[PDB]
Design a protein around this ligand. Structure first.
Ligand SMILES: [Pt+2]
Ligand SMILES: [Pt+2]
Length: 129
């Protein structure tokens, strides 16, 4: 599924991301835009043996188990295929775990590089809610 920005904002808001650990909703929508282009099926298969999965491009070395990545920690306790679902709940829950395990949104390179310190509210501006 490829989300619209406002639809994704509403789904993320239903799952408690607005102001989760001090990160406003627009930050999360912006991260998804630049990680995956809002595409729940996105994958990036890396040369290090790992793969990035789903709307938030969560990596298979630390966070989810794809069976094939050296050094697997599976800290979200989920198969990586769960992060390719059309509903975002597993990706949201794992994103919350990523932050809970010592990280800011700095854990997402696209957030640091394309959302950090910008007008992230542009991603929710004009959305119904
Ligand atoms: Pt889909
Ligand atoms: Pt939730």
């Amino acid at each position: 599924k490829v989300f619209g920005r406002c639809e994704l904002a509403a789904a993320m808001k239903r799952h408690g991301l607005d102001n989760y650990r001090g990160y406003s909703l627009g930050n999360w929508v912006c991260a998804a835009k630049f990680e995956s282009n809002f595409n729940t099926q996105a994958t990036n298969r890396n040369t290090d043996g790992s793969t990035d999965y789903g709307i938030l491009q969560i990596n298979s070395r630390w966070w989810c188990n794809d069976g094939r990545t050296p050094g697997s920690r599976n800290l979200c306790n989920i198969p990586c295929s769960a992060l390719l679902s059309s509903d975002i709940t597993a990706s949201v829950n794992c994103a919350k775990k990523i932050v809970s395990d010592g990280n800011g949104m700095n854990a997402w390179v696209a957030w640091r590089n394309r959302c950090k310190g910008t007008d992230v509210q542009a991603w929710i501006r004009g959305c119904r809610a």
